[PDB]
Design a protein around this ligand. Structure first.
Ligand SMILES: *[C@H](C)[C@H]1/C(=C/c2[nH]c(/C=C3N=C(/C=C4\NC(=O)C(C=C)=C4C)C(C)=C\3CCC(=O)O)c(CCC(=O)O)c2C)NC(=O)[C@@H]1C
Ligand SMILES: *[C@H](C)[C@H]1/C(=C/c2[nH]c(/C=C3N=C(/C=C4\NC(=O)C(C=C)=C4C)C(C)=C\3CCC(=O)O)c(CCC(=O)O)c2C)NC(=O)[C@@H]1C
Lengths: 448, 445
């Protein structure tokens, strides 16, 4: 039913910057492994049914033995594991799927433990501090929140470009705030079609809230599984999951070799309001502690943003109902029949034509008298409403409302160059609550 | 909340008690030079320094490994030490692992040493992320929470802390307007009896404690009956050291005996803060047996309590907005439709004469406190001048003693109550409280 779903969830390819080993929870037998595992572990004795504890040191062995039995595996991540052959350190990110226990081995850049530990502690500390700074911001100012959070996230991660990508009502997105590198060109203010980010990706982002991609140009690695498995494994929770081909070529064409997307969650029962994407001109990999730290920071961001939204909304409605009982500051309309509205001529003509009504695009005759008068509300009072922003700067493509997603499509667009668009002469779409208030007010005026 | 300078009760002894809990060592060390200016009595015992190595005026860095030593050195010169807690430390000879919770005081720096479980170095990395991990999970339990409800928040949070730590009882204690508290939600052990619904006097928690919980948001007591440990400090020190932030700070005797009497041999209090900040209440934990939880869990719980604080603040503001929206929309509604409560049309004469004699907008809780109307159906009322509103008896359960408005904290008092037997008090001659929103709405009519 959902496009790209099974292809992202159970796509038998992982990123080549690390290796992955899928184990049977009850028998500790290997039921899956990526082809780069043998090379990365320096095995040059790894097959289907090989005891995992034989691949690593005995301490690591009994440690992961403790890990499998545990009520919650996530609490032991990451497991610092040494290899039998090489002796090089690996971060072990364990999680559970419907088949067994998946182990994500990510090579550790620092070899001496003290420096790595100090780095992790430093990262967590920087996350706590970033959140603390994020808490002291004045309320109501969401733009300041997003700017300070892209500056913070950029300061922590070190990516050349960091930005907040807001999902609008019609599922089309918009970079609302960014902290790019100075010499890089601004992607801020741009708009993108809804098909750039499929519903499947947004759903999986609601479930999995942090996704790292080290290199789009890097050749994906096929993970071979035991022939006894009914279907291809669920590599959603895997931090090494290779991106879909279309998004790989997408990142390739956009100039983002290394990506990192985090979810922005509110509620309406959770809802994905937007993302915070990070693009790097070159390829880079950040360790697990930094990633989890960023997930925490993004959790705080999601909470605070949710608060701001709720409070601003209820306060807005409260302000409407309070101003109801200054006439001009009642609704968002520019004209009220006084205000952004012509003389009694166009009024006479419109009234002449009128003999519950509301439109967002104004009746060709008197609609060319002014660019302001485009929205009409009739119920005896008349409401004029100004037209929307007549220019939208898209990033290579326009969001077509009747355009949907299909799993067979596996090739993106060629360029994301900013191009302007003149939307049809329309006013801002009249809300339903506004019309209900118009009815209530109509009854009120009918009484007296 | 209350002003800082007005609080005088228990403060001097709570801050500088000179007594710590016996589950961890405590060493106060000068900042410039790492010489010891203070140390607990049992400090030599847990570190295996018992026969000198540890004494007044000895380099504390020589009491641990060089790695732990330079960790401390970089901790002292940090921007803010509180962000480096806990500092992992190994002993010099016994090699015993310790969580070091550091606090910068007026003169020197207090170092709390908590005995940690010997874990494999391979988990060290996994150990570094633990606090934020537990915190992320617990808060994630709050993210998937339908906004609007205030009870489900406290319930799910209480349950979250219940599963996080492992206490036999976890609950939310809320401070009312007259400083007296009430248990709003709890996750008792199925065996135990519920403390839910019953209130407490304001003198149960002194102003000093509530004030102190602002700067120190987490407090753990592994055992009240455990014999406190005297801290030995230098002779040159003018006064007792400021153990206001120590995680080992022994409870003031009255609260220890309080815990003993209530049955809570193990306590864990976490303050919740909303919006110059305000203490809304605490989240307290009780255990039938002794319970010492590691510092990372207390940190995670602190995060969870910040999240809970902000979220609850949001819920409060939303609730206010909704209520105001309701009374306002009803106001406009009736105002439009026009163009028990008495309108001078009940929905008699003696009450009118009494009102004419008393008026020689008002809000009265007790008419006896016009005495004629007292001769209970018309408990209290609100007068608008000529419209009148007549409201009223709600029962309140107390857990041992009633809170009187004459109750004041006594700094010299050192003995708590004996019984917390839940008794029920009904209230007459005190009608339904005329809220600010209600009275302002009436005045706006
Ligand atoms: C294929 C023909 C179609 C397609 C498929 C597709 N896209 C994704 C995931 C993402 N797409 C994103 C789009 C942007 N990237 C940006 O930098 C910006 C703006 C500055 C946009 C709008 C983003 C973001 C994602 C998620 C990032 C991540 O790391 O996951 C996927 C899912 C792949 C996966 O494996 O998760 C797929 C299948 N996108 C297209 O544009 C065409 C139409
Ligand atoms: C002594 C004569 C008076 C007294 C002193 C006192 N109380 C505290 C601290 C707390 N008291 C609390 C009350 C409760 N605990 C509960 O579990 C419940 C209900 C279920 C209540 C109402 C709480 C909570 C605290 C804070 C906990 C903590 O660990 O600090 C103190 C300060 C203690 C310290 O840290 O030194 C003192 C001096 N309490 C009394 O009731 C009598 C009147």
């Amino acid at each position: 039913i959902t496009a790209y779903l099974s292809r992202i969830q159970r796509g038998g390819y992982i990123q080549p910057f690390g290796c992955m080993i899928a184990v049977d929870e009850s028998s500790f037998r290997i039921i899956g492994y990526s082809e780069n595992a043998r090379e990365m572990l320096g095995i040059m004795i790894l097959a289907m049914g090989t005891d995992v504890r034989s691949l690593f040191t005995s301490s690591s062995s009994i440690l992961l033995e403790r890990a499998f039995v545990a009520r919650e595996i996530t609490l032991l991540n990451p497991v610092w594991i040494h290899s039998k052959n090489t002796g090089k350190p690996f971060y072990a990110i364990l999680h559970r799927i419907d088949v067994g226990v998946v182990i994500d081995l990510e090579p550790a850049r620092t070899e001496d433990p003290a420096l790595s530990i100090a780095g992790a502690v430093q990262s967590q500390k920087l996350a706590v501090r970033a959140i603390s700074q994020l808490q002291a911001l004045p309320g109501g100012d969401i733009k300041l929140l997003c700017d300070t959070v892209v500056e913070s996230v950029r300061d922590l991660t070190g990516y050349d470009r960091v930005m907040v990508y807001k999902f609008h009502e019609d599922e089309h997105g918009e970079v609302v705030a960014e902290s790019k590198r100075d010499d890089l060109e601004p992607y801020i203010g741009l708009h993108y079609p809804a098909t750039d980010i499929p519903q499947a990706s947004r759903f999986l982002f609601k479930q999995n809230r942090v996704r790292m991609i080290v290199d789009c140009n890097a050749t994906p690695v096929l993970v071979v599984q035991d022939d006894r498995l009914t279907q291809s494994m669920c590599l959603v929770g895997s931090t090494l999951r290779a991106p879909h081909g279309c998004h790989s070529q997408y990142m390739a064409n956009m100039g983002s070799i290394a990506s990192l997307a985090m979810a922005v969650i509110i509620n309406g029962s959770m809802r994905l309001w937007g993302l915070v994407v990070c693009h790097h001109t070159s390829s880079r990999c950040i360790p697990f502690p930094l990633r989890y730290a960023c997930e925490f920071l993004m959790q705080a961001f999601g909470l605070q943003l949710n608060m701001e939204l709720q409070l601003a909304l209820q306060m807005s409605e409260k302000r409407v109902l309070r101003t109801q009982t200054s006439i001009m500051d009642l609704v968002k309309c520019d004209g009220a029949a006084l205000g952004v509205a012509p003389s009694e001529v166009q009024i006479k003509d419109v009234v002449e034509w009128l003999l519950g009504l509301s439109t967002d695009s104004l009746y060709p005759g008197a609609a060319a008298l002014g660019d302001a008068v485009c929205g009409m509300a009739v119920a005896f009072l008349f409401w004029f409403r100004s037209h929307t922003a007549k220019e939208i700067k898209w990033g290579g493509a326009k969001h077509h409302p009747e355009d949907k997603d299909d799993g067979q499509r596996m090739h993106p667009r060629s360029s994301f160059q900013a191009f302007l668009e003149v939307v049809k002469s329309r006013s801002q779409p009249w809300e339903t609550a506004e019309m209900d208030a118009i009815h209530s007010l109509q009854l009120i005026l009918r009484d007296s």
